[PDB]
Amino acid sequence: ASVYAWNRKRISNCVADYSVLYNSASFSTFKCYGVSPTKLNDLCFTNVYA
Amino acid sequence: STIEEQAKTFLDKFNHEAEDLFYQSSLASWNYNTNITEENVQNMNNAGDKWSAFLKEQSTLAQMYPLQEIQNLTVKLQLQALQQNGSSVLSEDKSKRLNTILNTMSTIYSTGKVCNPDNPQECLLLEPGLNEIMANSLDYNERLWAWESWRSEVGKQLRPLYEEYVVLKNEMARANHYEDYGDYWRGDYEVNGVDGYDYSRGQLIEDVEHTFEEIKPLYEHLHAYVRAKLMNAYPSYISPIGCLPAHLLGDMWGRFWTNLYSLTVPFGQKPNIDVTDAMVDQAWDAQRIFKEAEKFFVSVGLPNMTQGFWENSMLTDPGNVQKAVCHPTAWDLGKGDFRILMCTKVTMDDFLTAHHEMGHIQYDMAYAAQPFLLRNGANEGFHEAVGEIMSLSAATPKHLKSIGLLSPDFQEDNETEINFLLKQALTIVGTLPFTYMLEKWRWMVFKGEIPKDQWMKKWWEMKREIVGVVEPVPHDETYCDPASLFHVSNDYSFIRYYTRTLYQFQFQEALCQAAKHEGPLHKCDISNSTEAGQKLFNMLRLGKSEPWTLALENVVGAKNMNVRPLLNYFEPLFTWLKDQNKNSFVGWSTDWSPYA
Amino acid sequence: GNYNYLYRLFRKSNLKPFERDISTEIYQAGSTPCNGVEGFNCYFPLQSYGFQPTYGVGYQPYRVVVLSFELLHAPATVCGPKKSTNLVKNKCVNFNFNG
Ligand SMILES: *[C@@H]1O[C@H](CO)[C@@H](O)[C@H](O)[C@H]1NC(C)=O
Ligand SMILES: *[C@@H]1O[C@H](CO)[C@@H](O)[C@H](O)[C@H]1NC(C)=O
Ligand SMILES: *[C@@H]1O[C@H](CO)[C@@H](O)[C@H](O)[C@H]1NC(C)=O
Ligand SMILES: *[C@@H]1O[C@H](CO)[C@@H](O)[C@H](O)[C@H]1NC(C)=O
Ligand SMILES: *[C@@H]1O[C@H](CO)[C@@H](O)[C@H](O)[C@H]1NC(C)=O
Ligand SMILES: *[C@@H]1O[C@H](CO)[C@@H](O)[C@H](O)[C@H]1NC(C)=O
């Protein structure tokens, strides 16, 4: 989508594997604010907004 | 709300849409230059017409915002640049006539073909047919024939066209609240609104005369030495007391004296610093030339070239099937796209040209953070000067030894420095009186000091007085001798070379003082010095946002253009020329004593 | 040139966090009413990008995905994949079965 009409996908009731994203070589920026990438694969959240 | 916020939003819209339109136009020009085909010409013409119409519509929108209600200096500078009418203030018939005159002068200069009467079956164009004859021949009457025949054909075609051109450009300039077209050209150096750093249009001519009065003894000694050597080359034509014959200067017009280095060499017996054979022996590709130039620019601390530079530039001649312009040109296409179009050979000249054009690319990259209409040099002199300083630094024997191109047991004695400095003077110092005389003549033509029936009588009088060059035979008013040169026939300013030459040595002294070089100025190399690159990049990052006087304060610590760095650069050569001119007579006579 | 990507260039006020503005109403920069037509001091707020493959790295298109993690008083259901140690029997071990 365009940045004025940015797509929001609500992610619920599943298992989120964040190490697949973190260990990928295809991403240039993976800057996390408020949480560290190492404990993302452990913690649990109510909803994820993408 | 306020006028200033309205202008700021309008400038944001202008910047954003102009950057993409300028990209499209520049890409069309690039596709024409790397591929000379008729559809690329049509696409270039369509993009240029769209770009010019967009600039007309944005200037029309821009004039509705008055200047005096805006206090921010950058916003006022962009609005001042945009609100210029250009040719739009002139009537549509006269604007069409001026455009037609410019286009037909372009066709006459580009497709001008001249050869000897009674042998008309084939003829030679200016480049490269006449350039090689002017640069390499040793025959007096052949060079006289080529010079007089090309000024006969070109001047007799261009004289009524130039007479219309001066009147139309003066009409447009006085319609644009200028005194003449010369004042319009001098308005590039005009700084208004900055406390202390203001520069006036009338101060430029005074500063040029003040610097040229200090140029004059060095040029007189160089002219006397070149006169003595050309007297040795041509025994009877050149007089000891008079000016140089016009067709013997090594180029078509007298623009540069660098083709007389073979005839006027001080110490021919001593070797040269030619590194061509060393690159041929090590098989240096043009890619290696540009990588060594990039290594030079990363050694001083400047940013290295983008990936898109290496992907998208044409650094080698494509072949017979594909046609391209051979002239080396650095392209700032917009949006972070930087390319070099050069047909690079394995020569020293192409290596120095690669450094010069990559200096142009570095200058273009430095002001990429600026808004679009401020993406230029602070004046027209800085843009060429930052390439010429790289040409100065790369040409040094220390740089050649550092990159391995010169033998480490090469002996650097005083004689090689003298003849190298003489070559640099024939290239650099010799163009200064010709440039000053041409610009002063054009300023007097636009100002109306010289009537149309008296253009040439004054002009040769100026050339004898300033350049020290005499006409072979007298010319009447059917000739148009200035307009045989590319820049004047195609509506280009010419004082940029004078300002470039002085700014070159001012920047050279500033960076060598930054680099803590302890010897002669011409022995100085700016590699390995991070602080010199930082001092350069402080001015380079500004672009057109700041006045050129403030930028010159940022580099050299002076508020005005200065002539002393040039004299300091050539001071060993100046003392050597003063020693060599004891028997001979320095200076020339304006009389017809050699030949007329 | 890929002109399928738009961005808002002008708005009267700054956006709130996680706000989407898809309005296509003419921005009024001046005192005069726009009246729905793009004239003088009145600009269309959405402007197209012009992505090309020959662009610089500061102008090339970048796809950005922002993941927002919030904890609310409802039971958290998006959990990570807890790793499982192979089962060992007949030994005194510390077992952790489903908490
Ligand atoms: C140059 O133009 C010709 C003519 O169509 C074309 O075949 C060729 O691919 C072009 N080359 C480049 C490098 O664009
Ligand atoms: C002038 O405007 C530019 C942006 O348009 C801004 O960054 C700068 O701070 C302004 N200068 C002053 C003195 O307000
Ligand atoms: C441009 O031309 C228009 C009409 O000829 C005039 O009103 C305006 O003042 C001119 N602008 C400048 C900067 O001379
Ligand atoms: C420019 O330099 C950086 C860091 O020194 C390097 O990562 C990059 O690859 C260089 N660019 C090119 C085109 O080699
Ligand atoms: C070079 O130096 C030597 C020794 O000092 C001297 O004899 C010679 O004249 C000098 N040559 C030049 C051109 O300065
Ligand atoms: C400048 O730095 C490069 C990089 O190490 C080096 O090879 C070169 O010799 C240096 N220049 C001088 C004059 O030492």
PDB file of all heavy atoms in Angstrom, chain B residues 1 52 71 80 114 134 151 179 193 196 199 209 216 240 243 257 275 317 335 338 406 459 465 511 515 539:
ATOM      1  N   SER B   1      -1.904  30.760   5.516  1.00  0.00           N
ATOM      2  CA  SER B   1      -2.141  31.955   6.318  1.00  0.00           C
ATOM      3  C   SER B   1      -1.314  33.135   5.815  1.00  0.00           C
ATOM      4  O   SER B   1      -1.778  33.922   4.990  1.00  0.00           O
ATOM      5  CB  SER B   1      -1.826  31.682   7.790  1.00  0.00           C
ATOM      6  OG  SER B   1      -2.363  32.696   8.622  1.00  0.00           O
ATOM      7  N   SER B  52      10.529  23.429 -19.829  1.00  0.00           N
ATOM      8  CA  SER B  52      10.500  24.880 -19.986  1.00  0.00           C
ATOM      9  C   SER B  52       9.102  25.443 -19.754  1.00  0.00           C
ATOM     10  O   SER B  52       8.954  26.513 -19.149  1.00  0.00           O
ATOM     11  CB  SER B  52      11.009  25.264 -21.376  1.00  0.00           C
ATOM     12  OG  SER B  52      10.131  24.795 -22.384  1.00  0.00           O
ATOM     13  N   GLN B  71      11.106  36.956   5.118  1.00  0.00           N
ATOM     14  CA  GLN B  71      12.301  37.273   5.886  1.00  0.00           C
ATOM     15  C   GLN B  71      13.333  36.157   5.900  1.00  0.00           C
ATOM     16  O   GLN B  71      14.509  36.435   6.153  1.00  0.00           O
ATOM     17  CB  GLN B  71      11.943  37.627   7.341  1.00  0.00           C
ATOM     18  CG  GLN B  71      11.397  39.045   7.589  1.00  0.00           C
ATOM     19  CD  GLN B  71      10.100  39.353   6.862  1.00  0.00           C
ATOM     20  OE1 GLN B  71       9.255  38.478   6.673  1.00  0.00           O
ATOM     21  NE2 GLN B  71       9.937  40.606   6.453  1.00  0.00           N
ATOM     22  N   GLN B  80      13.530  34.502  -5.429  1.00  0.00           N
ATOM     23  CA  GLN B  80      14.254  35.383  -6.340  1.00  0.00           C
ATOM     24  C   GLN B  80      14.705  34.640  -7.591  1.00  0.00           C
ATOM     25  O   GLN B  80      14.657  35.188  -8.698  1.00  0.00           O
ATOM     26  CB  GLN B  80      15.459  35.990  -5.622  1.00  0.00           C
ATOM     27  CG  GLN B  80      15.172  37.294  -4.903  1.00  0.00           C
ATOM     28  CD  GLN B  80      16.355  37.786  -4.096  1.00  0.00           C
ATOM     29  OE1 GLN B  80      17.461  37.255  -4.205  1.00  0.00           O
ATOM     30  NE2 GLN B  80      16.129  38.808  -3.277  1.00  0.00           N
ATOM     31  N   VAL B 114      34.727  24.376 -43.790  1.00  0.00           N
ATOM     32  CA  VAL B 114      35.522  25.352 -44.531  1.00  0.00           C
ATOM     33  C   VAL B 114      36.719  24.616 -45.119  1.00  0.00           C
ATOM     34  O   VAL B 114      37.400  23.871 -44.405  1.00  0.00           O
ATOM     35  CB  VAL B 114      35.995  26.512 -43.624  1.00  0.00           C
ATOM     36  CG1 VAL B 114      36.981  27.424 -44.348  1.00  0.00           C
ATOM     37  CG2 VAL B 114      34.818  27.328 -43.096  1.00  0.00           C
ATOM     38  N   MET B 134      45.610  23.299 -36.268  1.00  0.00           N
ATOM     39  CA  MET B 134      46.010  24.436 -35.442  1.00  0.00           C
ATOM     40  C   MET B 134      46.969  24.015 -34.330  1.00  0.00           C
ATOM     41  O   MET B 134      47.879  24.770 -33.970  1.00  0.00           O
ATOM     42  CB  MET B 134      44.783  25.139 -34.866  1.00  0.00           C
ATOM     43  CG  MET B 134      43.957  25.857 -35.917  1.00  0.00           C
ATOM     44  SD  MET B 134      44.905  27.045 -36.891  1.00  0.00           S
ATOM     45  CE  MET B 134      45.180  28.344 -35.693  1.00  0.00           C
ATOM     46  N   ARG B 151      37.499  32.433 -40.186  1.00  0.00           N
ATOM     47  CA  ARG B 151      36.880  33.642 -39.670  1.00  0.00           C
ATOM     48  C   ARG B 151      36.165  34.407 -40.765  1.00  0.00           C
ATOM     49  O   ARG B 151      35.169  35.063 -40.465  1.00  0.00           O
ATOM     50  CB  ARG B 151      37.903  34.544 -38.981  1.00  0.00           C
ATOM     51  CG  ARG B 151      37.997  34.306 -37.488  1.00  0.00           C
ATOM     52  CD  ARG B 151      39.381  34.590 -36.965  1.00  0.00           C
ATOM     53  NE  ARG B 151      39.464  34.413 -35.520  1.00  0.00           N
ATOM     54  CZ  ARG B 151      39.641  33.248 -34.910  1.00  0.00           C
ATOM     55  NH1 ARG B 151      39.750  32.120 -35.591  1.00  0.00           N
ATOM     56  NH2 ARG B 151      39.709  33.218 -33.583  1.00  0.00           N
ATOM     57  N   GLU B 179      20.654  46.955 -16.564  1.00  0.00           N
ATOM     58  CA  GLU B 179      21.222  48.002 -17.410  1.00  0.00           C
ATOM     59  C   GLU B 179      21.487  47.480 -18.816  1.00  0.00           C
ATOM     60  O   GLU B 179      21.178  48.154 -19.806  1.00  0.00           O
ATOM     61  CB  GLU B 179      22.510  48.538 -16.787  1.00  0.00           C
ATOM     62  CG  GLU B 179      22.399  48.867 -15.310  1.00  0.00           C
ATOM     63  CD  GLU B 179      23.750  48.937 -14.628  1.00  0.00           C
ATOM     64  OE1 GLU B 179      24.769  49.087 -15.337  1.00  0.00           O
ATOM     65  OE2 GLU B 179      23.796  48.845 -13.384  1.00  0.00           O
ATOM     66  N   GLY B 193      21.145  41.515   0.834  1.00  0.00           N
ATOM     67  CA  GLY B 193      20.410  41.218   2.043  1.00  0.00           C
ATOM     68  C   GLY B 193      21.234  40.659   3.185  1.00  0.00           C
ATOM     69  O   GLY B 193      20.707  40.533   4.297  1.00  0.00           O
ATOM     70  N   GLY B 196      27.275  42.777   5.615  1.00  0.00           N
ATOM     71  CA  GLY B 196      28.712  42.673   5.416  1.00  0.00           C
ATOM     72  C   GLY B 196      29.131  41.903   4.180  1.00  0.00           C
ATOM     73  O   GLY B 196      30.106  42.266   3.519  1.00  0.00           O
ATOM     74  N   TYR B 199      27.502  41.795  -2.178  1.00  0.00           N
ATOM     75  CA  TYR B 199      28.330  42.001  -3.355  1.00  0.00           C
ATOM     76  C   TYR B 199      27.474  42.605  -4.455  1.00  0.00           C
ATOM     77  O   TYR B 199      26.339  42.173  -4.679  1.00  0.00           O
ATOM     78  CB  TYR B 199      28.966  40.694  -3.839  1.00  0.00           C
ATOM     79  CG  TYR B 199      30.186  40.906  -4.706  1.00  0.00           C
ATOM     80  CD1 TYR B 199      31.435  41.139  -4.139  1.00  0.00           C
ATOM     81  CD2 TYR B 199      30.087  40.882  -6.092  1.00  0.00           C
ATOM     82  CE1 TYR B 199      32.553  41.335  -4.932  1.00  0.00           C
ATOM     83  CE2 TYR B 199      31.198  41.078  -6.892  1.00  0.00           C
ATOM     84  CZ  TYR B 199      32.427  41.304  -6.307  1.00  0.00           C
ATOM     85  OH  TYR B 199      33.532  41.499  -7.101  1.00  0.00           O
ATOM     86  N   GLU B 209      39.456  44.100 -12.837  1.00  0.00           N
ATOM     87  CA  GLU B 209      40.571  44.984 -13.200  1.00  0.00           C
ATOM     88  C   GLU B 209      41.659  45.002 -12.128  1.00  0.00           C
ATOM     89  O   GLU B 209      42.854  45.022 -12.455  1.00  0.00           O
ATOM     90  CB  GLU B 209      40.091  46.411 -13.481  1.00  0.00           C
ATOM     91  CG  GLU B 209      39.009  46.544 -14.531  1.00  0.00           C
ATOM     92  CD  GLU B 209      39.566  46.793 -15.913  1.00  0.00           C
ATOM     93  OE1 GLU B 209      40.805  46.804 -16.065  1.00  0.00           O
ATOM     94  OE2 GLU B 209      38.764  46.977 -16.854  1.00  0.00           O
ATOM     95  N   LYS B 216      49.161  41.256 -14.744  1.00  0.00           N
ATOM     96  CA  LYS B 216      49.860  41.810 -15.910  1.00  0.00           C
ATOM     97  C   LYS B 216      51.391  41.661 -15.966  1.00  0.00           C
ATOM     98  O   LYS B 216      51.893  41.398 -17.072  1.00  0.00           O
ATOM     99  CB  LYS B 216      49.455  43.284 -16.074  1.00  0.00           C
ATOM    100  CG  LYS B 216      49.686  43.853 -17.466  1.00  0.00           C
ATOM    101  CD  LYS B 216      49.511  45.364 -17.472  1.00  0.00           C
ATOM    102  CE  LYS B 216      49.912  45.967 -18.808  1.00  0.00           C
ATOM    103  NZ  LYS B 216      50.002  47.452 -18.742  1.00  0.00           N
ATOM    104  N   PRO B 240      60.836  41.800 -32.262  1.00  0.00           N
ATOM    105  CA  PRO B 240      61.193  41.886 -30.833  1.00  0.00           C
ATOM    106  C   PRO B 240      60.355  42.868 -30.030  1.00  0.00           C
ATOM    107  O   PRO B 240      60.256  42.707 -28.808  1.00  0.00           O
ATOM    108  CB  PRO B 240      62.665  42.320 -30.864  1.00  0.00           C
ATOM    109  CG  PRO B 240      63.157  41.922 -32.216  1.00  0.00           C
ATOM    110  CD  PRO B 240      61.985  42.092 -33.135  1.00  0.00           C
ATOM    111  N   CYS B 243      53.601  42.608 -30.965  1.00  0.00           N
ATOM    112  CA  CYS B 243      52.709  41.550 -30.517  1.00  0.00           C
ATOM    113  C   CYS B 243      52.924  40.268 -31.321  1.00  0.00           C
ATOM    114  O   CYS B 243      53.581  40.251 -32.365  1.00  0.00           O
ATOM    115  CB  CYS B 243      51.257  42.009 -30.613  1.00  0.00           C
ATOM    116  SG  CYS B 243      50.891  43.540 -29.729  1.00  0.00           S
ATOM    117  N   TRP B 257      47.193  28.211 -24.486  1.00  0.00           N
ATOM    118  CA  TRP B 257      48.526  28.198 -25.069  1.00  0.00           C
ATOM    119  C   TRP B 257      49.215  26.856 -24.863  1.00  0.00           C
ATOM    120  O   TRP B 257      50.427  26.748 -25.081  1.00  0.00           O
ATOM    121  CB  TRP B 257      49.389  29.315 -24.476  1.00  0.00           C
ATOM    122  CG  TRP B 257      48.986  30.720 -24.837  1.00  0.00           C
ATOM    123  CD1 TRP B 257      47.858  31.117 -25.497  1.00  0.00           C
ATOM    124  CD2 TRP B 257      49.728  31.915 -24.560  1.00  0.00           C
ATOM    125  NE1 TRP B 257      47.848  32.484 -25.638  1.00  0.00           N
ATOM    126  CE2 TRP B 257      48.986  32.997 -25.074  1.00  0.00           C
ATOM    127  CE3 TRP B 257      50.947  32.174 -23.926  1.00  0.00           C
ATOM    128  CZ2 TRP B 257      49.424  34.316 -24.974  1.00  0.00           C
ATOM    129  CZ3 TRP B 257      51.380  33.484 -23.826  1.00  0.00           C
ATOM    130  CH2 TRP B 257      50.621  34.539 -24.349  1.00  0.00           C
ATOM    131  N   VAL B 275      53.291   9.478 -17.587  1.00  0.00           N
ATOM    132  CA  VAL B 275      53.023   8.202 -16.935  1.00  0.00           C
ATOM    133  C   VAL B 275      52.199   7.273 -17.816  1.00  0.00           C
ATOM    134  O   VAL B 275      51.729   6.239 -17.333  1.00  0.00           O
ATOM    135  CB  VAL B 275      52.345   8.402 -15.571  1.00  0.00           C
ATOM    136  CG1 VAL B 275      53.355   8.897 -14.552  1.00  0.00           C
ATOM    137  CG2 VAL B 275      51.181   9.373 -15.692  1.00  0.00           C
ATOM    138  N   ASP B 317      34.214   4.033 -24.664  1.00  0.00           N
ATOM    139  CA  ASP B 317      33.538   4.217 -25.944  1.00  0.00           C
ATOM    140  C   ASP B 317      32.787   2.947 -26.340  1.00  0.00           C
ATOM    141  O   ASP B 317      33.373   1.855 -26.309  1.00  0.00           O
ATOM    142  CB  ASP B 317      34.545   4.591 -27.029  1.00  0.00           C
ATOM    143  CG  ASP B 317      33.878   5.056 -28.309  1.00  0.00           C
ATOM    144  OD1 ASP B 317      33.601   6.267 -28.430  1.00  0.00           O
ATOM    145  OD2 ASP B 317      33.628   4.209 -29.192  1.00  0.00           O
ATOM    146  N   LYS B 335      17.788  13.148  -7.868  1.00  0.00           N
ATOM    147  CA  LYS B 335      17.263  12.076  -7.017  1.00  0.00           C
ATOM    148  C   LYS B 335      18.371  11.107  -6.613  1.00  0.00           C
ATOM    149  O   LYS B 335      18.136   9.907  -6.457  1.00  0.00           O
ATOM    150  CB  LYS B 335      16.067  11.341  -7.644  1.00  0.00           C
ATOM    151  CG  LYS B 335      14.886  12.259  -7.924  1.00  0.00           C
ATOM    152  CD  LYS B 335      13.565  11.614  -7.550  1.00  0.00           C
ATOM    153  CE  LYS B 335      12.546  12.654  -7.111  1.00  0.00           C
ATOM    154  NZ  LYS B 335      11.211  12.050  -6.846  1.00  0.00           N
ATOM    155  N   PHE B 338      23.944   9.970 -10.146  1.00  0.00           N
ATOM    156  CA  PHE B 338      25.167  10.642 -10.561  1.00  0.00           C
ATOM    157  C   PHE B 338      25.905   9.754 -11.550  1.00  0.00           C
ATOM    158  O   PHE B 338      26.160   8.583 -11.254  1.00  0.00           O
ATOM    159  CB  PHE B 338      26.042  10.920  -9.337  1.00  0.00           C
ATOM    160  CG  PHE B 338      25.360  11.744  -8.285  1.00  0.00           C
ATOM    161  CD1 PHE B 338      24.842  11.135  -7.149  1.00  0.00           C
ATOM    162  CD2 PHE B 338      25.169  13.105  -8.457  1.00  0.00           C
ATOM    163  CE1 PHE B 338      24.186  11.877  -6.183  1.00  0.00           C
ATOM    164  CE2 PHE B 338      24.527  13.856  -7.485  1.00  0.00           C
ATOM    165  CZ  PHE B 338      24.030  13.239  -6.351  1.00  0.00           C
ATOM    166  N   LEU B 406      54.535   6.300 -10.970  1.00  0.00           N
ATOM    167  CA  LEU B 406      55.849   6.859 -11.243  1.00  0.00           C
ATOM    168  C   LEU B 406      56.899   6.063 -10.479  1.00  0.00           C
ATOM    169  O   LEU B 406      56.622   5.509  -9.411  1.00  0.00           O
ATOM    170  CB  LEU B 406      55.908   8.344 -10.850  1.00  0.00           C
ATOM    171  CG  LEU B 406      57.067   9.196 -11.375  1.00  0.00           C
ATOM    172  CD1 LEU B 406      57.015   9.294 -12.891  1.00  0.00           C
ATOM    173  CD2 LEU B 406      57.051  10.579 -10.745  1.00  0.00           C
ATOM    174  N   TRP B 459      38.243  46.302 -30.954  1.00  0.00           N
ATOM    175  CA  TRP B 459      38.520  44.932 -30.501  1.00  0.00           C
ATOM    176  C   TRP B 459      39.977  44.545 -30.687  1.00  0.00           C
ATOM    177  O   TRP B 459      40.627  44.081 -29.738  1.00  0.00           O
ATOM    178  CB  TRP B 459      37.628  43.941 -31.250  1.00  0.00           C
ATOM    179  CG  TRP B 459      37.614  42.555 -30.669  1.00  0.00           C
ATOM    180  CD1 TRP B 459      37.097  42.171 -29.467  1.00  0.00           C
ATOM    181  CD2 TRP B 459      38.148  41.369 -31.271  1.00  0.00           C
ATOM    182  NE1 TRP B 459      37.270  40.821 -29.284  1.00  0.00           N
ATOM    183  CE2 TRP B 459      37.915  40.305 -30.376  1.00  0.00           C
ATOM    184  CE3 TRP B 459      38.801  41.105 -32.479  1.00  0.00           C
ATOM    185  CZ2 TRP B 459      38.311  38.998 -30.652  1.00  0.00           C
ATOM    186  CZ3 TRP B 459      39.195  39.806 -32.750  1.00  0.00           C
ATOM    187  CH2 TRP B 459      38.946  38.769 -31.842  1.00  0.00           C
ATOM    188  N   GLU B 465      46.294  45.702 -26.704  1.00  0.00           N
ATOM    189  CA  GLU B 465      46.550  46.327 -25.408  1.00  0.00           C
ATOM    190  C   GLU B 465      46.582  45.299 -24.285  1.00  0.00           C
ATOM    191  O   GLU B 465      47.404  45.400 -23.367  1.00  0.00           O
ATOM    192  CB  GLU B 465      45.503  47.400 -25.114  1.00  0.00           C
ATOM    193  CG  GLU B 465      45.867  48.316 -23.956  1.00  0.00           C
ATOM    194  CD  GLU B 465      46.724  49.490 -24.389  1.00  0.00           C
ATOM    195  OE1 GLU B 465      46.668  49.861 -25.581  1.00  0.00           O
ATOM    196  OE2 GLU B 465      47.455  50.041 -23.539  1.00  0.00           O
ATOM    197  N   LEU B 511      43.490  24.453   1.167  1.00  0.00           N
ATOM    198  CA  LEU B 511      43.603  23.030   1.477  1.00  0.00           C
ATOM    199  C   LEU B 511      45.036  22.622   1.795  1.00  0.00           C
ATOM    200  O   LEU B 511      45.246  21.722   2.617  1.00  0.00           O
ATOM    201  CB  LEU B 511      43.055  22.181   0.328  1.00  0.00           C
ATOM    202  CG  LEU B 511      41.581  22.327  -0.065  1.00  0.00           C
ATOM    203  CD1 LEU B 511      41.142  21.140  -0.907  1.00  0.00           C
ATOM    204  CD2 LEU B 511      40.688  22.463   1.162  1.00  0.00           C
ATOM    205  N   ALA B 515      46.291  20.967   5.101  1.00  0.00           N
ATOM    206  CA  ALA B 515      47.049  19.721   5.081  1.00  0.00           C
ATOM    207  C   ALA B 515      48.457  19.866   5.642  1.00  0.00           C
ATOM    208  O   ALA B 515      49.183  18.864   5.676  1.00  0.00           O
ATOM    209  CB  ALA B 515      47.122  19.168   3.655  1.00  0.00           C
ATOM    210  N   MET B 539      32.136  23.867   2.703  1.00  0.00           N
ATOM    211  CA  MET B 539      31.655  24.724   1.624  1.00  0.00           C
ATOM    212  C   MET B 539      30.843  23.931   0.608  1.00  0.00           C
ATOM    213  O   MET B 539      29.869  24.451   0.047  1.00  0.00           O
ATOM    214  CB  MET B 539      32.844  25.410   0.949  1.00  0.00           C
ATOM    215  CG  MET B 539      32.526  26.414  -0.164  1.00  0.00           C
ATOM    216  SD  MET B 539      32.339  25.760  -1.840  1.00  0.00           S
ATOM    217  CE  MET B 539      34.036  25.349  -2.231  1.00  0.00           C
TER     218      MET B 539
END
